[PDB]
Amino acid sequence: STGPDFIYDDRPAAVSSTFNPEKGYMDFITAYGKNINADNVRIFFLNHKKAKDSLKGSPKVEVDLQFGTLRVKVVNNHNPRNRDNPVADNAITLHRLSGYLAKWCFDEIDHGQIEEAEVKSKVVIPLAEAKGCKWGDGVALYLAFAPGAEMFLKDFEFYPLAIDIQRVVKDGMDITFMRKVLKQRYGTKTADDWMISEVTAIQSAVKVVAKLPWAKAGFTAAAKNFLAKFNISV
Amino acid sequence: DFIYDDRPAAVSSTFNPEKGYMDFITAYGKNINADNVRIFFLNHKKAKDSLKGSPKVEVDLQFGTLRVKVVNNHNPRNRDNPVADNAITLHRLSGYLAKWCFDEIDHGQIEEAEVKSKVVIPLAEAKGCKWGDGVALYLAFAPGAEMFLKDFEFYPLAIDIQRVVKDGMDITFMRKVLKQRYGTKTADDWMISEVTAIQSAVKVVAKLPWAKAGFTAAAKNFLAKFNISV
Amino acid sequence: TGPDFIYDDRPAAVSSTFNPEKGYMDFITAYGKNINADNVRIFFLNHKKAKDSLKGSPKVEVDLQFGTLRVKVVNNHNPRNRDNPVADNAITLHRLSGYLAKWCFDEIDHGQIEEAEVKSKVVIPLAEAKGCKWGDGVALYLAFAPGAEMFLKDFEFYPLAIDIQRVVKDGMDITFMRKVLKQRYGTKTADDWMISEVTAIQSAVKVVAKLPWAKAGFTAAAKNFLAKFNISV
Amino acid sequence: PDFIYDDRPAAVSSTFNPEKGYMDFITAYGKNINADNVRIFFLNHKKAKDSLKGSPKVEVDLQFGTLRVKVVNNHNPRNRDNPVADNAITLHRLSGYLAKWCFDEIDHGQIEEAEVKSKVVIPLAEAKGCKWGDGVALYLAFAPGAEMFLKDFEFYPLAIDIQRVVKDGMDITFMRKVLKQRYGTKTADDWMISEVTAIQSAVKVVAKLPWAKAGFTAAAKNFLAKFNISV
DNA sequence: ACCAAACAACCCACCCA
DNA sequence: ACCAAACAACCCACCCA
């Protein structure tokens, strides 16, 4: 009795956003590196969306998820109530984990020929394949399609940014989705630095991404000529 | 503990719509009639939404007196399930029933009359197609009809093309029909060898009212008289 | 066994041959004792609300009350249940609205006092939203009522001209005109009056065109001020 | 009868005075108004609104932070027309009153201004890239209900509406409410004639805003411009 | 083939912030 | 900060008067 019909609470986040992707990655590797392998990573990239919806459904504050043998304690920010709690710089989210695992594939491939073969034969990024990108297209480019990859703009050669740009231009993506990539750093350069100083490299990347099949994959060449014969720009 | 996530795999498709149809007819044909089929086509979207709503993997649906167990691949929880070649989806059930109407009409005069008088396909009438326009063309509007490009004379293909040209449908939706076979010919074959028939289909579909549907020529002339196209 | 979902629509085997004049006569005969300017006012003020409420109901036939007017209405508003066969003797919200528009139309003709009563109590929001008032005329003002298209002749082609004006000016979708383009005009069919009655129709269109429309709800001063900032009301 | 409907009398033009309503509101709830509760309110306006369109109750008790306020619900299509007394509070009025509260609190001094500016966020303002540094009257003008205080907010709510019609093609009818509001003691027919200059000043001010869905930095818009992207 | 638009009163959506 | 987008395989929209 004497009880409010509705009741409301604050969402103070975030004060400073002092989050550093390189640090987050290094810490993450120190904490989970023993159980990270190509199998577990393949599983993650294949089950990201599902894990995401599972999180939007769940009420817990910290959820312990398992991919293969990879067990990770991750902060839930998908349902409205939980995310009201702001997310610390040492906390791991699905987005951050996706980025970290993308970078993991990137370094592991550099470890050598056998690791390269394993990662390339097992790791699949659906968002990359949907535009007809393969590993053969290049490591940085293929890995840039992974969510969170924008956290490592330099390693991926501006590719996440170029991809976002192309999704806006071609696929009519909402501009808001680019905001994440637009405060990110490029090596030591700040956004205000590389937005002015690196436009050339970014445009090169854009050209590279433009060479991709994109919407035109997968339609066989025969399919594309056929569609052309009926006045359809594929 | 506490949530688990795993590898699927990567397999190739052996599914044959003719075999699937023959099997389906063997399993459920006794309760397939024009009445139940009418009910199906008028309640497809509804059944679809309920499937998107349901958590179940295999659902028992009843249209009229026709009871069919159908695999649900409309729910995101359930969109990761594999579909056996003997499995029935809403899309497959729709295709099978379209072909069923096609053969039933061929059985004789009374069957033809019953099918044409009872079965209505909303996607066709929304574009002003009627049975009189043709059996193959009218049935081509049914979802799943692309599984039988030959019986329907490439009409489903032409219809998708026209949805692109006129209604600006995104080209991605055309992938299914562009991988379909024509009898036994693969797409890479009939894309070259059957261009004439395809063009015929396209012209026929082009003759449809389309966006002009629901208005007579008299109505359109009248509206034109008041600066309204169409 | 049992089935999770179960279906039989089944809607129309074949066509509807509904006659608005007979429907009107039957409706007036059945409910006329409680039809007055007050209840009609209440109806026209609660039409949209009644509709959403209908979208909320599971019942096939819903009993609505406007003031003292108690009416059984076929619910055809749920995406579930939109079977629907609407009997020709059945009353829907749209038909009820048309019937009450015509009722006002005849009641006003009953005499000076009745005219004063109707004009003093009944308000149609769709008409006032385009700045139409009773002074603009009984047929025109009443034509804005939904269902008024059922009585094209009494309302002098106004519902038609209004629909046309909604398409041209306010970009209403042309499909909403399908209904008005099938109605009769007295004994004339649509195919007849589309050719034979263009004079009356054009007159109606001109009349409707003279209305304020989107400029309604703003004072002249407001319109001046707004004009000063490159915004044409 | 399943549903039943009633007369909806006519009903007479507003005698509502926001200065008076505000004074009543501060007298009744002012002990429980602080920057925290106001922040929470502005962050939960839309949600409280939705909850209200969902609730059937006539009088709803809402709680934002420690601020518990009894609010008239005029949000359900069934009751959107229930009586609203001039001393009654709706969500819109509450938002306006709290914007005004922020304005006066900021005027109290250096520290209060810092507290308010550090805690209070108006989402509609940030959606057009306005920050507190842009100006107090301007930033607060984005608050719903701010049109109730045109003088305090320097015709900023009006200019914002104008910029929304001109740039974002807002429907012009939504401007009818602000066009009845007063300016100090001036009536609309008066200030629409006597105050057009200040209004243009305000309009130019609002026009200089990024308005990009931002925050995107001028450098950001320049960068994106190089890649054929408008805002 | 029955539903978008909605008097007077102020209200009805934009809302990552 | 996030609700959009997701290999291979398969239905994801449009929807009678």
Coordinates of C-alpha atoms in Angstrom, one line a residue, chain D:
Chain D
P1 CA -23.3 -3.5 -23.3
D2 CA -19.6 -4.4 -23.9
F3 CA -18.4 -0.8 -24.5
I4 CA -20.3 2.4 -23.6
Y5 CA -19.6 6.0 -24.7
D6 CA -20.5 9.4 -23.3
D7 CA -21.1 12.9 -24.2
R8 CA -17.6 14.5 -24.3
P9 CA -18.9 18.1 -23.7
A10 CA -17.5 20.8 -25.7
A11 CA -15.3 21.9 -23.7
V12 CA -14.2 25.4 -22.8
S13 CA -10.9 27.0 -23.8
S14 CA -7.9 26.9 -21.4
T15 CA -7.6 29.0 -18.3
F16 CA -4.4 27.2 -17.4
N17 CA -1.5 29.3 -16.1
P18 CA 1.9 27.6 -16.1
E19 CA 3.4 30.2 -13.7
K20 CA 0.7 29.4 -11.2
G21 CA 0.8 25.6 -11.9
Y22 CA 4.6 25.8 -11.4
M23 CA 4.3 27.6 -8.1
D24 CA 1.8 25.0 -6.9
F25 CA 4.0 22.2 -8.1
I26 CA 7.2 23.5 -6.4
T27 CA 5.2 24.2 -3.2
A28 CA 3.9 20.6 -3.2
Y29 CA 7.0 18.6 -4.3
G30 CA 9.9 21.1 -4.2
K31 CA 11.4 19.4 -1.1
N32 CA 11.9 16.3 -3.2
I33 CA 13.3 17.9 -6.4
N34 CA 17.0 17.5 -7.0
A35 CA 19.4 17.1 -9.9
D36 CA 19.4 13.3 -9.6
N37 CA 15.6 12.9 -9.7
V38 CA 15.5 15.3 -12.6
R39 CA 18.2 13.4 -14.5
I40 CA 16.3 10.2 -14.0
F41 CA 13.1 11.8 -15.1
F42 CA 14.5 13.2 -18.4
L43 CA 16.1 9.7 -19.0
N44 CA 12.8 8.0 -18.4
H45 CA 10.2 10.3 -20.0
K46 CA 9.6 8.2 -23.0
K47 CA 9.3 5.0 -21.0
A48 CA 7.0 6.5 -18.4
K49 CA 5.0 7.7 -21.3
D50 CA 4.7 4.2 -22.7
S51 CA 3.9 2.8 -19.3
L52 CA 1.1 5.4 -19.1
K53 CA -0.4 4.6 -22.5
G54 CA -0.3 1.1 -21.2
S55 CA -2.0 1.8 -17.9
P56 CA -5.8 2.2 -17.6
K57 CA -5.7 4.1 -14.3
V58 CA -7.1 7.6 -14.1
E59 CA -4.6 8.8 -11.6
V60 CA -1.1 7.2 -11.7
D61 CA 1.6 7.5 -9.0
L62 CA 5.0 7.8 -10.7
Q63 CA 8.4 7.7 -8.9
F64 CA 11.5 9.1 -10.4
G65 CA 14.4 8.7 -8.0
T66 CA 13.0 9.9 -4.7
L67 CA 10.4 12.1 -6.4
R68 CA 7.0 10.5 -6.1
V69 CA 4.4 12.5 -8.0
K70 CA 0.7 11.8 -8.6
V71 CA 0.0 12.4 -12.3
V72 CA -3.2 12.6 -14.4
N73 CA -3.2 10.0 -17.2
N74 CA -4.3 11.4 -20.5
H75 CA -2.3 8.8 -22.5
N76 CA -4.8 6.0 -23.0
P77 CA -6.9 6.3 -26.2
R78 CA -9.8 5.3 -23.9
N79 CA -9.1 8.1 -21.4
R80 CA -7.1 10.7 -23.4
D81 CA -10.0 13.1 -22.7
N82 CA -10.5 12.8 -18.9
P83 CA -10.7 16.1 -17.0
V84 CA -7.4 17.9 -16.4
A85 CA -7.7 20.5 -13.7
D86 CA -5.3 23.5 -14.0
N87 CA -3.6 22.3 -10.8
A88 CA -3.4 18.8 -12.2
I89 CA 0.0 17.5 -13.5
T90 CA 0.6 15.5 -16.7
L91 CA 3.9 14.1 -17.9
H92 CA 4.3 17.1 -20.3
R93 CA 3.6 19.6 -17.6
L94 CA 5.9 17.8 -15.2
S95 CA 8.7 17.9 -17.8
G96 CA 8.2 21.6 -18.4
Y97 CA 8.1 22.3 -14.6
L98 CA 11.4 20.4 -14.1
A99 CA 13.0 22.2 -17.0
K100 CA 12.0 25.5 -15.3
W101 CA 13.3 24.1 -12.0
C102 CA 16.7 23.4 -13.7
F103 CA 16.6 27.0 -14.9
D104 CA 16.0 28.6 -11.5
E105 CA 18.3 26.2 -9.7
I106 CA 21.1 27.1 -12.2
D107 CA 20.3 30.7 -11.4
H108 CA 20.8 30.1 -7.6
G109 CA 24.6 30.0 -8.0
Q110 CA 27.9 28.6 -9.2
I111 CA 27.7 25.2 -7.4
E112 CA 24.1 24.4 -8.2
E113 CA 24.7 25.2 -11.8
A114 CA 27.7 22.8 -11.8
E115 CA 25.5 20.0 -10.2
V116 CA 22.7 20.4 -12.7
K117 CA 25.0 20.6 -15.7
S118 CA 27.0 17.6 -14.5
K119 CA 23.9 15.4 -13.9
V120 CA 21.0 16.5 -16.0
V121 CA 20.8 15.2 -19.6
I122 CA 18.1 16.1 -22.1
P123 CA 18.2 13.3 -24.8
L124 CA 16.4 15.4 -27.5
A125 CA 19.1 18.1 -27.1
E126 CA 22.0 15.6 -27.4
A127 CA 20.2 14.1 -30.5
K128 CA 20.9 17.4 -32.2
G129 CA 24.3 17.8 -30.7
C130 CA 23.5 20.5 -28.2
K131 CA 25.4 20.5 -25.0
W132 CA 25.2 22.7 -21.8
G133 CA 28.1 24.8 -23.1
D134 CA 25.9 25.8 -26.0
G135 CA 23.7 27.6 -23.6
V136 CA 21.4 26.9 -20.7
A137 CA 18.2 28.3 -22.2
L138 CA 18.9 26.5 -25.5
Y139 CA 19.8 23.2 -24.0
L140 CA 16.8 23.2 -21.6
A141 CA 14.5 24.4 -24.5
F142 CA 14.7 20.9 -25.9
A143 CA 12.8 19.6 -22.9
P144 CA 9.2 18.8 -23.6
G145 CA 6.9 21.4 -21.9
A146 CA 9.6 24.1 -22.2
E147 CA 7.2 26.0 -24.4
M148 CA 5.3 26.8 -21.2
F149 CA 8.2 29.2 -20.4
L150 CA 9.0 31.1 -23.6
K151 CA 10.4 34.1 -21.7
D152 CA 12.8 32.2 -19.5
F153 CA 13.9 30.1 -22.5
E154 CA 14.2 33.0 -24.9
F155 CA 11.8 31.7 -27.6
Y156 CA 14.2 28.8 -27.9
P157 CA 11.5 26.1 -27.9
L158 CA 9.8 28.1 -30.7
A159 CA 12.9 28.3 -32.8
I160 CA 13.6 24.6 -32.3
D161 CA 10.1 23.8 -33.6
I162 CA 10.7 26.1 -36.6
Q163 CA 14.0 24.4 -37.3
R164 CA 12.3 21.0 -37.1
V165 CA 9.6 22.0 -39.6
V166 CA 12.1 23.6 -42.0
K167 CA 14.9 21.0 -41.7
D168 CA 13.3 17.8 -40.5
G169 CA 9.9 18.3 -42.2
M170 CA 8.1 18.0 -38.9
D171 CA 4.3 18.3 -39.3
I172 CA 3.3 21.9 -39.0
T173 CA 0.3 21.1 -36.8
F174 CA 2.6 20.2 -33.9
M175 CA 3.4 23.9 -33.7
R176 CA -0.1 24.9 -32.8
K177 CA 0.5 24.4 -29.0
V178 CA 3.5 26.8 -28.8
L179 CA 1.6 29.4 -30.9
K180 CA -0.8 29.9 -28.0
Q181 CA 1.9 30.2 -25.4
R182 CA 2.5 33.5 -23.7
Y183 CA 5.7 35.5 -23.5
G184 CA 5.9 37.1 -20.0
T185 CA 2.5 38.9 -20.1
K186 CA 2.3 39.1 -23.9
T187 CA -0.3 37.1 -25.8
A188 CA 0.6 35.2 -29.0
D189 CA -1.1 37.8 -31.2
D190 CA 1.0 40.4 -29.5
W191 CA 4.5 38.7 -29.3
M192 CA 4.1 37.3 -32.9
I193 CA 4.1 41.0 -33.9
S194 CA 6.3 42.7 -31.4
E195 CA 9.1 40.1 -30.9
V196 CA 10.0 38.8 -34.4
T197 CA 13.6 40.0 -34.2
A198 CA 14.6 38.1 -31.1
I199 CA 12.9 35.1 -32.6
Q200 CA 15.1 35.3 -35.6
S201 CA 18.1 35.5 -33.3
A202 CA 17.0 32.3 -31.7
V203 CA 16.4 30.7 -35.1
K204 CA 19.9 31.5 -36.3
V205 CA 21.3 30.2 -33.0
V206 CA 19.5 26.8 -33.4
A207 CA 20.5 26.7 -37.1
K208 CA 24.2 26.7 -36.2
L209 CA 23.7 23.4 -34.4
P210 CA 25.2 20.2 -35.9
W211 CA 21.8 18.5 -35.9
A212 CA 23.5 15.4 -37.1
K213 CA 22.0 12.7 -34.8
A214 CA 25.4 13.5 -33.3
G215 CA 27.8 13.8 -31.6
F216 CA 29.8 14.0 -34.7
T217 CA 32.7 16.4 -34.8
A218 CA 33.0 19.1 -37.5
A219 CA 36.1 17.1 -38.3
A220 CA 33.8 14.0 -38.4
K221 CA 31.3 15.6 -40.8
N222 CA 34.2 16.8 -43.0
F223 CA 35.7 13.4 -43.0
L224 CA 32.4 11.7 -43.8
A225 CA 31.7 14.4 -46.4
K226 CA 34.9 13.2 -48.2
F227 CA 33.2 9.8 -48.6
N228 CA 29.9 11.0 -50.1
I229 CA 28.0 10.8 -46.8
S230 CA 25.5 13.4 -45.7
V231 CA 25.3 13.5 -41.9

